[PDB]
Symmetry: C3
C-alpha cells in the first residue's frame, strides 16, 4: 500500500468534511526578514518594533499577507494539489495579531461542491481557518478551486454552492492597535496622506515595476511550505502549454501590496480580503506593476483614530499603454491584467 499522499481529487471530497492539515508552523524573525527580502515591503508597522509599540502592539507584528500565505500553503497538499486553478476568495477576516514566535495550524471544511459540465473537473468550496498556539483564530477565509477528477466516470456529488459574502463587514474587522496624532510619526510612516484625504473613486498609479525571478517565487513558495507542482518542476512544466513554471498567485498579491506603498503608505495593515482573482498566469521574466482604486471609505464602529478603506489593487504585467487597465473587453479582463484584488485596509485618521 502506497506510502505517499496523492492529495484529493474532486470525487474524493465530501460535503461537510473537516480536514486537519499537516505541518504547523512557528513563525520567526527569520521568516520576517525573508518576506522583506522577497517583496521589499516598506510599511512601517512590520519594519519597526518601536513603531509598532507606539501603536500599542507588543512588537512588530507579522505581515498579514505572510500570515495568509502560510495558512494557505498548509491547505495546498489536501485541497489544491490536484487543482487546475483557484477561482476566488471571500470572507477573509484577519483575527488575532500574529507575532514572531507564534505557531499556526490550519483546518479546512468542505462547504460546497459542483462538478463541471464537461464532467472532467469540479469546483470545491472550502472554509479554511488558521489558529495560533492559544487556539485563537488569526485568519479565516473561503476559497474555491477547480480540481481534477481522477476518474472522469466517477458519479457527480449533489451540487451544493454556499452563499458567499461580498466583503467582510466593517463590524467584523479586528482593529488591534491604536493611533494618536501625538504619537504618530508621518515622516517615518512615509506619507502625509491620512484616511480623511483619500477620495472614494480615486485611482492611484503605483508607478514602480518589478521583474520576477525563478529563484524568487520558488523561495517564497517554499517559505510558505506550499507544494503545488506547477511552481517547481521545469521538467514537467516545460512540456505544458505555457512551457514554464507558474508563479504562485499569492506572490503577485504580495508584490502588489508592496508596490502599493507608493501611494498608500498609511494603509498600515490589511484587515480583510473581500475577493481575489488571478486573472492571467504570471511567469519569471514578467515585470509586475500595480494600480489601486478606493472603492469605499468606511468608519470603524466605536473608533475615530483609525478608519477603513476598501481598496481594489490591480496588478499588470509589462504595463500596456492605456492607464489603469481593467476590463475593456466587455467583462473580459485586459490580457495584461494578472490580479484583481479587493481588500480592506486600516488607516490612521486625522485628529
Amino acid at each position: 500500500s502506497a506510502k505517499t499522499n496523492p492529495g484529493n481529487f474532486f470525487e474524493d471530497f465530501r460535503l461537510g468534511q473537516t480536514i486537519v492539515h499537516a505541518t504547523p508552523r512557528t513563525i520567526t524573525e527569520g521568516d520576517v526578514a525573508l518576506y522583506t527580502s522577497l517583496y521589499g515591503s516598506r510599511f512601517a508597522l512590520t519594519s519597526s518594533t518601536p513603531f509598532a509599540q507606539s501603536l500599542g502592539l507588543e512588537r512588530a507584528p507579522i505581515d498579514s499577507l505572510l500570515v495568509f500565505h502560510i495558512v494557505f500553503g498548509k491547505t495546498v497538499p489536501d485541497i489544491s494539489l490536484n487543482a487546475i486553478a483557484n477561482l476566488g476568495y471571500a470572507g477573509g477576516r484577519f483575527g488575532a495579531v500574529v507575532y514572531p514566535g507564534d505557531t499556526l495550524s490550519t483546518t479546512s471544511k468542505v462547504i460546497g461542491l459542483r462538478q463541471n459540465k464537461d464532467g472532467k473537473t469540479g469546483v470545491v468550496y472550502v472554509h479554511s481557518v488558521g489558529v495560533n498556539q492559544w487556539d485563537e483564530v488569526v485568519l479565516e477565509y473561503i476559497r474555491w478551486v477547480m480540481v481534477r477528477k481522477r476518474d472522469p466516470n466517477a458519479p457527480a456529488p449533489e451540487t451544493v454552492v454556499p452563499d458567499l459574502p461580498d466583503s467582510v463587514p466593517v463590524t467584523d474587522l479586528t482593529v488591534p492597535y491604536t493611533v494618536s496624532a501625538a504619537n504618530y510619526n508621518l515622516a517615518h510612516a512615509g506619507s502625509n496622506y491620512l484616511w480623511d484625504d483619500y477620495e472614494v473613486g480615486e485611482k492611484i498609479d503605483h508607478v514602480d515595476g518589478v521583474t520576477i525571478e525563478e529563484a524568487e517565487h520558488m523561495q517564497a513558495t517554499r517559505l510558505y511550505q506550499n507544494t503545488a507542482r506547477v511552481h517547481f518542476n521545469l521538467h514537467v512544466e516545460r512540456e505544458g502549454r505555457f512551457g514554464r513554471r507558474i508563479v504562485y498567485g499569492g506572490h503577485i498579491i504580495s508584490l502588489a501590496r508592496s508596490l502599493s506603498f507608493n501611494g498608500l503608505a498609511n494603509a498600515l495593515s490589511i484587515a480583510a480580503i473581500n475577493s481575489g482573482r488571478h486573472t492571467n498566469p504570471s511567469f519569471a521574466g514578467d515585470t509586475i506593476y500595480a494600480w489601486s482604486e478606493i472603492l469605499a471609505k468606511m468608519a470603524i464602529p466605536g473608533r475615530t483614530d483609525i478608519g477603513a478603506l476598501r481598496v481594489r489593487t490591480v496588478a499588470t504585467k509589462d504595463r500596456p499603454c492605456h492607464d489603469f487597465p481593467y476590463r475593456d473587453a466587455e467583462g473580459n479582463y485586459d490580457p495584461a491584467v494578472v490580479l484583481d484584488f479587493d481588500y480592506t485596509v486600516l488607516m490612521p485618521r486625522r485628529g
Copy 2:
C-alpha cells in the same frame, strides 16, 4: 609572503594531523527560515516549537542536515578547496541536539592517505568533529576526498587507509526526544504510517520534482560558508568541461530529504549518515526527483516508543522512464542518478 590561504594540496597533508577550522558559527532562527525557504522541508519536528516541545525538546531543533552542511562547510577551506571530488562518507553520528543560539566549531583529523596511481592526485580520509559551545559533539563523520597534487613530482606518502564502518550502529544512535501516542498528532505530522507499518525492502516513489536555480544553490552554499569555487565562478567554470557551475552535493541531499516527506513524513529526524555517493554532477536547470528503499528496520535498545529505519534515498535528474533507477549497468550507476544516500532515521512506533 602571501597573505592568502591556498588551502591544502594532497602532498600537504600529514597522517594524524589535526586541523582546527576557522569561523565558528552561531546558528539562528534566520538560518532556520532560510533553510526552509531553500528546500521546503515539511518535517513537523523542525517547523513547530510546540510540536518539538510535546516530544520533550526545548524548542524546535535545527535540522540535522543544516547542522551537517554547516560542519561540512567549515572544513572546506582546509580539506576540499583543492579537491576533484568527495568520494564517500562513513560513521556520521549525530550527537547532542542543536538549537537556535548554539555555536558550532569544527576540527578535522587526517586518518588516511593514498596517492592515486597516475600520481596527479591523492585520496585523503578525514575524521571531522563538530562541537557546540559546551564542547558537546553534535556531529562526527568520516569523509574522503580526491585532492589535487600541486607538484606531480612530490613524493607519495605511505599509504594508510582506515577501516570504514558500514553504518553507525543502532547502539550509537542518540534518541533525544520521546513519543507517546497520547501526545503525538498524526494529522500534524502528516502521515498515519508509523515504524510498524513500513516493510523492509519496500520502495517509495516520492513523486515530486524540483528544479535547481543558480541563485538557489549559491545561496545555500553561502549559508554554509562553504567556499568551494566550482559552485560560484561562472567565469572559470564556463571554460571547464561541464561549462557551468556545479551544485554542492549536499544541496542534493537536502532536496532529497525534503522530497522524501512525501512517503516518509514520520521519519522525524536523521540520526546517522552511513554512506553517500554523489554519483553524477548536478547543475542549475536540472529537476531533482527522489525515491527511497527501506534497507532495514531496527529496534532501539531500551526504547519501544521510537524505532530506527535504515533508508536509501536515491536522487535522479529529470527522471527517466524505468522506475526506481539505480545501477542497471553492472555496478555502474544509471546516468540519471546523482545521489545514493544511505542513512538512518528515527520514527515513532505504535503504542
Copy 3:
C-alpha cells in the same frame, strides 16, 4: 492631487534642508542570516556570538556594511530615486555598535548643490546620519549624487560645494571591542597574520571570483528596502543602453569585503569608509574578483591591542590578464574595474 512620491529632482533640493526618511528598521537575526547567505562573509566577529563576547561585546554585532546598506537604502526614495549615479562617499564614520533587535532611522541634510554645465542634471551633496532607538549615531557619511532635473529650464541654485574630508581621522574611530592574546583564537579567526605583519604598500590578490545572479542582487536590495528602479525593472531597463538591470553598487562593496577574507581575515570590522567609486556598472552574469592594497597603517590613540589599516579594495569583473588592474589609462580606470573602495579596518595587534 497625486498620492504617490515622485522623489526629489535636482531643482527640488534646498541647501540646508533636512529630510527625515521613512521606514525605520529593526534589524534582526533574520537579517543577519540573509546577509550571510547573500555574500558568504566568513569574518569571525559577525558569525559567532561567543567569539564576539570574548572581545567584550554583548553578542555578535551586525556587519558594518549591513548597517551601511540599510542606512543608505532609507535615503534612496528621497535622495537618489531620480539619480543618474552616485559620485562618491566621504567621512563615513561608524559610531555605536548595532546588535540584533536595534532599530535604525535615517535623516539627510543637503550640504551642497551644483547644477551641471549641460543644465540637464545637477550634483547634490548630502550628510546622512543613522541613529539607533537610543538616538545614538551608528553611522554618518557624506555622499554626492548626480540627479536629473525634471525641468531643464528651472533656474540653477547657487553653487555650494562642501569641503570633503580625505579620510575619517584615526582619532574619530570607534573601537568598541578589546583583544587580548590570552583570549584571541587565531585558528577560529582564520589567519595568523596580525596588524604587525602587514606591509604598507603590499598588494593582496583575494583569488576567488563569484558570479552575480539577478535574484541575488534584487534580494539584497529588497533587504535594504532600497527602491532604485534600475535594479528591479527589466521591462524598462531592457530598453535602456545596457539593456539589463544594474546591480546596486553597495552589493559590489559587500562582495569585495567578503572576498577580502582571503588575505585580510583578521580585519575584524570596518570602522570607516573614506571614499568609494563605482567606476563601471555591474550586471547579473558578471563574475566579481577583488584585490587590496595596504594604503597605510596607523596606531589607535590610547590602544596597543588593536590597530588600524587603511585599505583600498578594488573589485573587477571577469578579471583580465594583468594583475592588480587599476588605472593604466592615465587616470582612467581599466574597463574591468567596477569598484574602488577606500576604507579603514580594525585589526588585533601582537601582544
